[PDB]
Amino acid sequence: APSRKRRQRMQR
Amino acid sequence: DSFPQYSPKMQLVCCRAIVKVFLALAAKGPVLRNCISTVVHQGLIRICSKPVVLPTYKDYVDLFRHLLSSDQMMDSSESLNHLLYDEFVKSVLKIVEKLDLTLEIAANLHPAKPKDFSAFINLVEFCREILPEKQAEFFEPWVYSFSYELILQSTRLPLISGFYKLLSITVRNAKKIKYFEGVPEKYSCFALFVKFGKEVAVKMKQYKDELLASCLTFLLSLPHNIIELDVRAYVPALQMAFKLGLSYTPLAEVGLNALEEWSIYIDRHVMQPYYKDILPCLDGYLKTSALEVSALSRAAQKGFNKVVLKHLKKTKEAISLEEIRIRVVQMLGSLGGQINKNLLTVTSSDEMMKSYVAWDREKRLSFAVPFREMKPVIFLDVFLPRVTELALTASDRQTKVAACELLHSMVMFMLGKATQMPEGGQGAPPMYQLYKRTFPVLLRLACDVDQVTRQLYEPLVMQLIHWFTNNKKFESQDTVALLEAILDGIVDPVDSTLRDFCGRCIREFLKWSIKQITPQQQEKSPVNTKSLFKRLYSLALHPNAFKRLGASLAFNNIYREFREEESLVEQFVFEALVIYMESLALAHADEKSLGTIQQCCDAIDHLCRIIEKKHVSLNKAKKRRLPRGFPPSASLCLLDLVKWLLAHCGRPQTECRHKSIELFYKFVPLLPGNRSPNLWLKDVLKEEGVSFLINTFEGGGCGQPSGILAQPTLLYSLQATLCWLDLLLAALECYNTFIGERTVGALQVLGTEAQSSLLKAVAFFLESIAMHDIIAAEKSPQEG
Amino acid sequence: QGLIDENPGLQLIIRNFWSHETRLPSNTLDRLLALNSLYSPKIEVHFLSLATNFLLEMTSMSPDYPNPMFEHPLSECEFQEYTIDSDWRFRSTVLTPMGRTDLLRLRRRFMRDQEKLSLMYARKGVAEQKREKEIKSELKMKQDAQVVLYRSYRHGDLPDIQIKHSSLITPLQAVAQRDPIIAKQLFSSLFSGILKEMDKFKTLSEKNNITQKLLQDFNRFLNTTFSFFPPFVSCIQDISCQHAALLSLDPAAVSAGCLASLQQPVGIRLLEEALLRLLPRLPPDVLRWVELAKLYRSIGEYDVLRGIFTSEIGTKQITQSALLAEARSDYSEAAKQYDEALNKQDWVDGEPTEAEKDFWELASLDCYNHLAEWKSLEYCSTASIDSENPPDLNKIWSEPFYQETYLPYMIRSKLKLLLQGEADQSLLTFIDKAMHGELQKAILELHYSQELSLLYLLQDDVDRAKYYIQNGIQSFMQNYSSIDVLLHQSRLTKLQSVQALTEIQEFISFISKQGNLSSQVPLKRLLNTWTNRYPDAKMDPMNIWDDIITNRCFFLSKIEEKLTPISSLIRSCKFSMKMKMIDSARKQNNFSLAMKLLKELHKESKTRDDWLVSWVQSYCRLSHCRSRSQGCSEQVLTVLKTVSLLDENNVSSYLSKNILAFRDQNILLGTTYRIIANALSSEPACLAEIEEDKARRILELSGSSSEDSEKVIAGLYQRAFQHLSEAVQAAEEEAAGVIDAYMTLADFCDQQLRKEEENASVIDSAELQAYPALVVEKMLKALKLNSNEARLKFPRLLQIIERYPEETLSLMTKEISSVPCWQFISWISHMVALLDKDQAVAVQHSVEEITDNYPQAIVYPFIISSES
DNA sequence: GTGTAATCTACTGACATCAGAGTTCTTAGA
Known part of the structure; x- marks a missing residue:
């Protein structure tokens, strides 16, 4: 299975 | 002699001058070749006798390095630089044979004379800087001869560190030229280093400080081809x-x-x-x-x-x-x-x-x-x-x-x-x-x-150790912890200098256990005075080599107490002579390279000499300390415990039978009345008869497990038959001492009545064993 | 920063500057509080020794500093002064037996030969030139060896107990100044002593302010450290574990610090103490609970991660499923489970936390790294940082999360792709940019000096490779020496790097040498040593294994090019080296990494008999260990279908050129048949009836010829037994030999016995007229050797040789009496008690020997087995 | 030797200048 991701925003 | 005095480019020009005159002699053929050998010998004597403190050997090594190295000077040489290396290394063996290196008055001695001994130490640190790894076939003719003749010097004189230094250079130089490869004089120099390696790997278990470091530097430098022969010897x-x-x-x-x-x-x-x-x-x-x-x-x-x-x-x-x-x-x-x-x-x-x-x-x-x-x-x-x-x-x-x-x-x-x-x-x-x-x-x-x-x-x-003997504190477990710490200290299986110190610590602990504590408690209250002796006995009887070793190292220090004080407790060492001499029953069998215990039997020399100063009270009545190896308690015990040494002659344990024999032959005129070995033996040989002397010159050791039986060994093989080959060796070495000391009539000794060892066993050994054994059985390195 | 300055004179002036009672306070609490301001990370390696040097030197002025610790001598005794040599010496270095009144000074005269005067200065000048060289050489020796004593000593018959406070505190500081792990003990003990004391003096109203202030500082220390120096990172966390309020410390900061500083146990006890003390109300406190899991998973304690993730807290059971798969080492299944957790776009019971989403991100990054999926790991480690199509790697420095979590895997995966030939300039330009900034430089050359030394060596900068690798050795020693001795797992996981650094360093030596590179001769010698220098195949994990081997591979390809003007040498090493990574992956139970390696080498192995037989043997080994756990039915697919075809080879009957391979193949195809038959013994009625299609004819050719539904297992076992027996004949034509072969018969035979005793199979009983006779002689032939499995199994014999009585004859009549008698002491109480049963004829000869050799061993239990 | 003077000899920008080479015109000219 292909490995996919997306960006994330760190809320701090 | 003047090379050191020049500036740096002019120290090169001096080498050029001294280099050109040597070529000029060699062209004249051999009438001057022996003169070449004399100059480098003579110059070397003058530099190694140049003084040193802790114009010097380091001021000359540049010249000799240029001289013994510089291949370019012929074209701008190899047969000169070869020949002159051979003359230089020859002069080392000439000069060492000129030295005496005598050692008489490990710190308890001084060498012959400082103007001699310092010339060796300079020659050492000099030849160390100039001999190593010239390779080039220059060292190959020398390896066997140089090592053998210098090994003899070290075996004559242990405690001379420089021979381990020159031999470490010899063996590292040999390693790099691939000399021991494939195992001729080569398999002689192999066996020479194999047994020298095993031998010093024992000796250094008693060495210390900068002597220890020098023979360690030798041991670790041996080639892999030798080290694989029982690696456990070299690991420590x-x-x-x-x-x-x-x-x-x-x-x-x-x-x-x-x-x-x-x-x-x-x-x-x-x-x-x-x-x-x-x-x-x-x-x-x-x-x-x-x-x-x-x-x-x-x-x-x-x-x-x-x-x-x-x-x-x-x-x-x-x-x-x-x-x-x-x-x-x-x-x-x-x-x-x-x-x-x-x-x-x-x-x-x-x-x-x-x-x-x-x-x-x-x-x-x-x-x-x-x-x-x-x-x-x-x-x-x-x-x-x-x-x-x-x-x-x-x-x-x-x-x-x-x-x-x-x-x-x-x-x-x-x-x-x-x-x-x-x-x-x-x-x-x-x-x-x-x-x-x-x-x-x-x-x-x-x-x-x-x-x-x-x-x-x-x-x-x-x-x-002073504080932990005192009016309250001598009874404290603080001192039990202390004592058992130090009496684990003397045992250490991986340190030679810790054991010496812990022995000297036991020496002082014992002194203050007399000097500082009130003896009213001391007879039986403490866990120290006798508790030292009864603790020591276990360590001696133990089958572990280092425990055996430790127990001896304690006595090797505490001899000075019986030179001092213990007029009643004299008996406790009378117990200990048997206990310790029987620890040597355990010595022979194995562990040889780690087990320096056999040399530590020379501690028993003190347990002889305490008698030689005190013997007059060793036949006083009614002193009856229970011994080991004697069932019945007795009052004139102290006579027949010399008959016990006679009974303890012909055992298979090769060191113990030696120790027993000289000690017996001394103890005999140290009985009262008849006082010559022959004249005291006169009574036992006149009344007990030669059959008893057979039962006590072949039969000896742990009672009598049938030591007169000659034919079964011939007939009955197992590796354990070597313990009987040693029983035969003892069954020779008995007769070897009696007639040579002129103590018995010889035709009584070589008896008609069942003396079967000399009658059958010696004959068979010569007829059928002594040359008969390429591979053989009576019916690996073990045989070899 | 002037407080670490290189010159001891300037190092002292700045110390003396801060020590002044106006720069830095005099009362102990406000001093202790103020010292937290004397930090920035460029000081961190020294800090603990400075803070303690500022606290104890406040005592240099105290009224007790010159008082004695005890007032009276041990008893009546007298004392003296003393001196210690302390100059030039270690013991093992010297051999055994060895002006108005003075104006006469203006009386002088001067040369007039300028030439002679120049010779005087030339003669002085040469002596000076030697004097310069020798005094420099002496100053080299004495620089390493110079010392100073911090207390004075007396001498006497007794210990001088009445020492001044000064004489302990001065050396206590002098050691803490100098070894970091004593500086950790001392600051911790002394700090915790100060905070115990304030309860003597100050109210709850002060202690609120103080503990909030210390906590506020320690958050800063954990959030701003860059070097994570292990004694410092641990100290703050020992301290904050001792006291309430301090115990609230930022958990993601704590966990990052402990994970990077390789020092997990101290970080765990802090989060543990928080998770009880802060909750004796939202239950899960997920940020503490999930960061505590992340710490335990790093120390590899998978079997306790069950107890965290029970669905009562942290209620996303996908985490429990994912953890279960990696606890079984299905890193491929675990990578799928975390992937769908991040892809699942809406949730009944509401969304997972940022804490869990980040946990799945980190745990899945790690799965692809236990796998070898470099392109997926490189994609993943770069995908989350930036919104471009080609993501801007330069963003990684944007917040401490990416620099902690993503950066380590990102640089690893870029670097892995370069070495196996993918020509991207992305990493080299990223590092070139990073090396412009002083903090980014200090991160890289401290943590990544392996990867950096490979990167510049891919460029042929052997000079920058010499630099970064040497700095890799120096930064290893610092961290290793600083890890405290009780942390066996931490120190053990440092040692794993030491082989990798040494493969680089040996090659940088080799490539520099003109005599080594010219011709083949020392290249064979290098190739030899690498062929038998592995990590620990039972213990060291696979991510250090493929580090060694993808590096060895690169070096061999680089030497191959450098020495172009030895494929027959190089292929033999490269293939046998890669084969060892397969069997160690198998023994580590990591199957999908092993599959991926196996399929690559097949097309190489096909070319040659030794490579092909080894490939068949290593593939079939791997199928057994795979199939062993694979449930009811997938066993017969995973071990019949292809594996049974694979060992019959026409080419593997190459006149049995060496017998060891025949012995090995003679195990493999028969343990293959046992599994296939034992599957059908677990259930007969369903495996054939459900697996109905492709296998059935080759299954018939793999078993008995008959269509009788029961006889297939007996047919399978008959061809198994003869093959197992054939292995013995190869084994007796050479401790890796006969005992392993003999014990596999013994096992299969006696397993057929356990199953047999539960039913009645006459025609199995007929071949069993051989079975237990072939058990007893061959099984016991092991017991002259180490053989402990068989010594553990000996309690069976005496009851089988009762319930099948006749075959007892085959035990006593020949070589039970050959077994070294010391083997049979193990449970002698049982055999020596059985003396009334006829089978005691077996006991006889061995307990005769034990009565002869070892009466002490038999006597005590024997007196009561003799009774009654 | 080692170190600090003092001071010769270089190189460059710039200016004049001989020579040497490119270019148009008279006479003697098939």
């Missing part, structure tokens, strides 16, 4: 080399070269069991991480002119401890991960699991820090587990001494806090659990190498 040399090396860097440098060579070439399945206690010694080299304006600098500051090149061109000894640290990480990785796990104490085990508990159940050493506002409390017993490791094992010297003086001030704190009586017994005495853990550290760290550490803790342990 490399462990000891790493132990020394972290306070004497060139020994660590040797140790890493040895481990490197063994690692790469010895068979993997042979080597595997030993990494388990080679590797843990390396931790010290990585245990602590140790946490300019020169003329060229100022010159280059002003500009990059020609002057800078002069300084840099002119700019263009031991390995640094910074180099050893990177070398040990690199070398440790070089064993691969399968092996290098063994750096950590063990593979996963109870052994490290046992270490997670603190050294005490509850905090002793509560210490109030001197502040001005307040008095916060530190419990110092958290620092010991790390400070003890630093004080031994820190390779950075400045860390080490500061960790010592913390531990010194912290054990002063210890004694004081205990002596305020924080609790007075009713269980484990306070800090007994610390004392049990810090006393063994205090021993290991008195006879540390580092001289600044030794000058601090040798006096402190003797100081503690």
Whole structure:
């Protein structure tokens, strides 16, 4: 299975 | 003689002059060749006799290096540089044979004369700088002859360090020229080094200080082809080399070269069991991480002119401890991960699991820090587990001494806090659990190498040893912990200098156990005075070699008590002579290279001489200390215990039967009445008859397991038959002494009545064994 | 920063500057509080020794500093002064037997030969030039060896107990100044002593302010450290574990610090103490609970991660499923489970936390790294940082999360792709940019000096490779020496790097040498040593294994090019080296990494008999260990279908050129048949009836010819037994030999016995007229050797040789009396008690020998087995 | 030897200048 991701925003 | 006096380019021109005259003689044929040999011999005598202190041997080695090296001078030579090397190395054997090196008046002696002995030490440190690894076939004719003739000198004179130095150069030079490869004089020099290697690997288990370092440097330098012959003999040399090396860097440098060579070439399945206690010694080299304006600098500051090149061109000894640290990480990785796990104490085990508990159940050493506002409390017993490791094992010297003086001030704190009586017994005495853990550290760290550490803790342990004999404290388990720490100290299986110190510690503990304590309790109240003797006896009778060794090393010190005081307890050593001489029943069988126990039987010389000064009371009545090896108690016991030495002659144990015999032949005129060996033997031979003498000159040892039976050994093979070949050897060496001392009528001795050993066994040995044994059986290295 | 300055004179002036009672306060609390301001990370390696040097030197002025610790001597005794040599020496270095009144000074005269005067200065100049060289050489020796003593000593017949407070505190500081792990013990003990004391003086209203202030600082220390120096990172966390309020410390900061500083156990006890003390109300406190899991998973304690993730808290059971798969080492299944957790776009019971989403991100990054999925790991480690199509790697420095979590895997995966030939300039330009900034430089050359030394060596900068690798050795020693001795797992996981650094360093040596590179001769010698220098195949994890082997591979390809003008040498090493990574992956139970390696080498192995037989043997080994756990039915597919075809080879009957391979193949195809038959013994009625299609004819050719539904297992076992027996004949034509072969018969035979005793199979009983006779002789032939499995199994014999009586004859009549008698002491109480049964004829000869050799061993239990 | 003077000899920008080479015109000219 292909490995996919997306960006994330760190809320701090 | 004048070479040292010149400027640097003119010291080259001098070599050019002295080099050209040697060529000019050799062209005249052989009438001047022997004159060449005399000049280099003569010049060498004048430099090695040039004075030295702790115009010098270092001022000349540049000349001799140029002379013995410079191949370019013929074209701008090889047959000269060859010949002249042979003349130089010849002169070393001539000069050593001119030296006497006599040693008569290990510190208890002085050499013959300083104007002789210093010429050897200079020749040593000189020839060390100039002989090594010239290769080029220049050393190949010499290896066997030079080693053999210099080995003889070392076997004549142990305790002369320089022969191990010249022999270490010899064997390293040999290793690099591939000389021992494939196992002629070559398989003679092989067997020569094999038995010399086994032999000194015993001898160094008694050596110390800079003598020890020199013969260690020899041992670790032997070639892999020899070392694989019972590796366990050599392992405790490399462990000891790493132990020394972290306070004497060139020994660590040797140790890493040895481990490197063994690692790469010895068979993997042979080597595997030993990494388990080679590797843990390396931790010290990585245990602590140790946490300019020169003329060229100022010159280059002003500009990059020609002057800078002069300084840099002119700019263009031991390995640094910074180099050893990177070398040990690199070398440790070089064993691969399968092996290098063994750096950590063990593979996963109870052994490290046992270490997670603190050294005490509850905090002793509560210490109030001197502040001005307040008095916060530190419990110092958290620092010991790390400070003890630093004080031994820190390779950075400045860390080490500061960790010592913390531990010194912290054990002063210890004694004081205990002596305020924080609790007075009713269980484990306070800090007994610390004392049990810090006393063994205090021993290991008195006879540390580092001289600044030794000058601090040798006096402190003797100081503690005084305090721990006293009117109250002699009964305390503080002293039981102390005694059993020191009497584990003498046993140590991997240190030669710890055992000596712990012996000298037992010496002092015994002295103050007489001198300081009131003897009214001392007869039976303590756990010290006799408790030393009864403890020692177990250690002697033990089958472990180092326990046997330890028990002897204790007596090798305490002889001076019977030269002093113990007029009743004289008897306890009368017990001990049998107990100790029977420990030599255990000596013969095995362990030879580790077991120096047979030489430690020379301790029994004192147990002879105490008789030779006191014999008149050794036939006084009614002194009846129970001995070992004698069922019935007795009052004139002290006579027939000489008949016991006669009974204890013809046993198979080859050293014990020797010791028994000279001791018996002395003890005999040391009986009253008839006082010559022949004249006292006159009665036993006249009345007991030669059949009794047969039962006591063949039958001897642990009663009589049938020692007169000659034919079954002929007929009945098993390797254990060698213990009977030794029984025959004893069954010769008996007759070897009686008629030669003129103590018996010879035709009585060689009897008609069942003397079957000389009648059948000697004949068969000669007719059928002594030349008959290519491979054979009576019906590997073991046979060989 | 002037407080670490290189010159001890300037190091002292700045210390003396801060020590002044106006720069830095005099009362102990405000001093202790103020010292937290004397930090920035460029000081961190020294800090603990400075803070303690500022607290104890406040005592240099105290009224007790010159008082004695104890008032009276141990008894009546007398004392003296003393001196210690302390100059030039270690013991093992010397051999055994060895002006108005003075104006006469203006009386002088001067040369007039400028020539002679120049000769004077030339003669002085040469002596000076030697004097310069020798005094520099002596100053080299004495620089390493110089010391100083911090206390004075007395001497006497007794210990000098009445020492001044000064004489302990001065050396206590002098060691803490100098070894970091004593500086950890001392600051911790002394700090915790100060905070115990304030309860003597100050109210709850002060202690609120103080504990909030210390906590506020320690958050800063954990959030701003860059070097994570292990004694410092642990100290703050020992301290904050002792006291309430301090115990609230930022958990993601704590966990990052402990994970990077390789020092997990101390970080765990803090979060543990928080998770009880802060909750004796939202239950899960997920940020503490999930960061505590992340710490335990790093120390590899998978079997306790069950107890965290029970669905009562942290209620996303996908985490429990994912953890279960990696606890079984299905890193491929675990990578799928975390992937769908991040892809699942809406949730009944509401969304997972940022804490869990980040946990799945980190745990899945790690799965692809236990796998070898470099392109997926490189994609993943770069995908989350930036919104471009080609993501801007330069963003990684944007917040401490990416620099902690993503950066380590990102640089690893870029670097892995370069070495196996993918020509991207992305990493080299990223590092070139990073090396412009002083903090980014200090991160890289401290933590990544392996990867960096490979990167510049891919460029042929052997000079920058010499630099970064040497700095890799120095930064290893610092961290290793600083890890405290009780942390066996931490110290053990440092040692794993030491082989890798040494493969680089040996090659940088080799490539520099003109005599080594010219011709083949020392290249064979290098190739030899690497062929038998592995990590620990039972213990060291696979991410250090493929580090060694993808590096070895690169070096061999680089030497191959450098020495172009030895494929027959190089292929033999490269293939046998890669084969060892397969069997160690198998023994580590990591199957999908092993599959991925196996399929690559097949097309190489096909070319040659030794490579092909080894490939068949290593593939079939791996199928057994795979199938062993694979449930009811997938066993017969995973071990019949292809594996049974694979060992019959026409080419593997190459006149049995060496017998060891025949012995090995003679194990493999028969343990293959046992599994296939034992599957059908677990259930007969369903495996054939459900697996109905492709296998059935080759299953018939793999078993008995008959269509009788029961007889197939007996047919399978008959051809198994003869093959097992054939292995013995190869084994007796050479401790890796006969004992392993003999014990596999013994096992299969006696397993057929356990199953047999539960039913009645006459025709199995007929071949069993051989079975237990072939058990007893061959099984016991092991017991002259190490053989502990068989010594553990000996309690069976005496009851089988009762319930099948006749075959007892085959035990006593020949070589039970050959067994070394010391083997049979193990449970002698049982055999020596049985003396009334006829089978005691077996006991006789061995307990006669034990009565002869070792009466002490038999006597005590014997007196009561003799009774009654 | 080592270090600090003092001072010769270089190189460059710039200016004049001989020579040497490119270019148009008279006479003697098939």
